[PDB]
Amino acid sequence: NIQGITKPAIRRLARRGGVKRISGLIYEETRGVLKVFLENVIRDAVTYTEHAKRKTVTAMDVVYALKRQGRTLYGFGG
Amino acid sequence: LRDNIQGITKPAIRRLARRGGVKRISGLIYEETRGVLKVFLENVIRDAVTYTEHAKRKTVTAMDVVYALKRQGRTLYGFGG
Amino acid sequence: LAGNAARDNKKTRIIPRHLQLAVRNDEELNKLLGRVTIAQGGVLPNIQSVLLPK
Amino acid sequence: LAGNAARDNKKTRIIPRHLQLAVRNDEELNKLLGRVTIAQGGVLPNIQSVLLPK
Amino acid sequence: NLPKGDWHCNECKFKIFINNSMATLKKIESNFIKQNNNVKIFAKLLFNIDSHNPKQFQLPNYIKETFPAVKTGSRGQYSDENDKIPLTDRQLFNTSY
Amino acid sequence: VKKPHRYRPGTVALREIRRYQKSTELLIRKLPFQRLVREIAQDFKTDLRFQSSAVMALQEASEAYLVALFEDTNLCAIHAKRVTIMPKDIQLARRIRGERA
């Protein structure tokens, strides 16, 4: 499932980041980093949804979770 | 007050680097560090003086500096707050 | 700034890309929205010099 | 942890150095106070491996 | 009363007069020596003046050293033991009342 | 005789950099990322539902974070006199950012 973050997708993300040449092992490292980031954000979002006594994670929960970590996100009813 | 940035002598920057775990320091590092320190102090004292002016005080109190640092994301313990 | 960017793109309606361009190109706005990510904004076209062909 | 650090130094009193050691040597506490400066705290003694003699 | 326009130093004039290649410089300097046979003993000394910019005269160190007392100054102010050590700005401009 | 038009290595990389810095669409396929988000969440709470906008916000934040991380990684690699990003570059970028201990 984490492997659903394919090698070409990480290549595209690196390219959008201005990366010209990518090492072979960068893909597994990037998968790990993305997993850590998603773990933090989703943990905070689920905390927010639990505190609201909801079984559905709303975009507002994600926005608040991101705002908590200093990654304010615009465009989802912030 | 003129040319006080040079008061941050070369040995003082050497000591700061050593506390940072630096073994060998390039000659050009001292001027760059002085510039960085000037930028940091400008950013902090600006907010400190803003707080002082809002309180209608002529004296910059340690709590103004603490508030400024906390605002910048560098919370400082040991001076109140 | 966003309408300026939209004109440069020959578009009469501001989309998130134009907002991102306006914010990031401007130094002061970019500093204000330093820790902000604009959805569907992308990034400024920027390639490091050493990566360009000789 | 601060008292443990003070004991390690054969000191009855906790000083800011001991608080800094306690906070920084503990993963969770150091993460809680990641963006905090402790006056007179100092730093954790560590030297990068490559800088040591062979 | 400047000549104005563009002025070249002796070195650049020689650079453009020689083209920096060695064979043409040889064809020029050997000819100079040949035409100066009367003073061939001084030939190359005469030759090398043209390629040198003007230089202020100063005694080479092998003559000043003969007298330990003497010593050059900041810009050539040729000093002796009789000249007082200059005072610093700290000793004059900062001394209090 | 015959010869393919193979571009010199590093040229299509530049073309892709230009193409992907000029666009804004998300670079990770929606469905795999949604499945990943659901799997990560199921650790924290069972039988969770996600608003489509919630997953979209997660994807936008994740992609922006990864792009910024790759920018810093590229800067780190160039600092090392290299052109390729390697895992140590990501590790240094994260360590300096303050993310990784």
Place this chain on the structure above:
Amino acid sequence: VKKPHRYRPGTVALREIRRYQKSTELLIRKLPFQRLVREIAQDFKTDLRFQSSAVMALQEASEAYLVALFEDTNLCAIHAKRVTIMPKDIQLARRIRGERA
């Protein structure tokens, strides 16, 4: 016919690293830093007074920030297979941190 006891270059540097990571006293001299603080503040409001505690707080914050910056700088210098920190290292550290644009 004897030679003095010169430590090999890099030995006294390591001794100093140990000494200054062991201690906590401020490394910048107090009066020069106070004069610098007042001079910088003179550009935001004239005839300002500073509590001694205020100057001490500024000095502690600045020294801590510089020490952290030098740690990051040393990390970048080592990343480039160097042992000496150079201004490019400080610039990269600041750029990755997000301080410098």
Place this chain on the structure above:
DNA sequence: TCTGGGTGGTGGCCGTTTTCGTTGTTTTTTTCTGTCTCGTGCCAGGAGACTAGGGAGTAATCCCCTTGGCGGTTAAAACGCGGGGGACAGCGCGTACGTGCGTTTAAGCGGTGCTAGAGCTGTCTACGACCAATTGAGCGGCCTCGGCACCGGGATTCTGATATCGCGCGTGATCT
């Protein structure tokens, strides 16, 4: 007249310029579709007018502490000399990404169904703000003392070189 050195011309090799075809991308005109913008209607939040109370403006007093200055001590900063180790430029290898073509997988889109839970509404109760009384926990201050900072003397690494001793490699001599 012969040999050597230098200049001039011709030929060969290398570098640069151009010169060309090929993909990839940009531009341009046509189509068409769905979201932006405008209008309509209702309602609920803002406005208006008015009263009450106290937060804050303002003056006066005072007592801290911030500034200034001055002298003595000496710790630290500076400047210089010297050397070596580190930066870095270069070279060579090797292999590991990149580019491209083919095959495979599953993302994506459109469509329909089901129901779970998020939202809204009504009702009710009990929890918290508010108020008054009061007394006790917390704070300022003073005193006593002992934990720790200072200084001196001593033990202990320990870092760097040289040299001695041991081990290994090379050269010479002797034996087979």
Place this chain on the structure above:
DNA sequence: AGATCACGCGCGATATCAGAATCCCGGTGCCGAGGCCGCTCAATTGGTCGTAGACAGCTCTAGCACCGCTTAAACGCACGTACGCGCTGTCCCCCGCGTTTTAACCGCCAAGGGGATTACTCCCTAGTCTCCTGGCACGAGACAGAAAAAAACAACGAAAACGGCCACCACCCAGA
């Protein structure tokens, strides 16, 4: 010529001769901490009233799920080239140690600006009732922009030509 033994040279390890810096052990004076005392302000006890939140019922929106096609994208494989990495050599920049100078630091004295507090008073803000019109939701319509197909053009990579540098041959000048 090969093997063994002895001597000489080179490299590694230990010791050591030292001497340098650090840590440790002891005595000492200190001032910073812990503690006791007194006063008072803020927290606790008791009571009220009102609205905020808990709870049940209902609605229907959105999430989930499923299916089936099509087709963009991932996966896989191969050739090779160019980038990473190791090794090496050179140069000088930076570390180290030492006089020499500077000014930081301490401490002590004198002055007063301004922080901090107190008391008075009023003007500003909360609160409330009545009024209404601005902002929101819903509906609609149409044009800005997505898409798309085709042409134009604008970046990527091979052989010929021109120019520059090197080598060889011929001619001229100089020397023998």
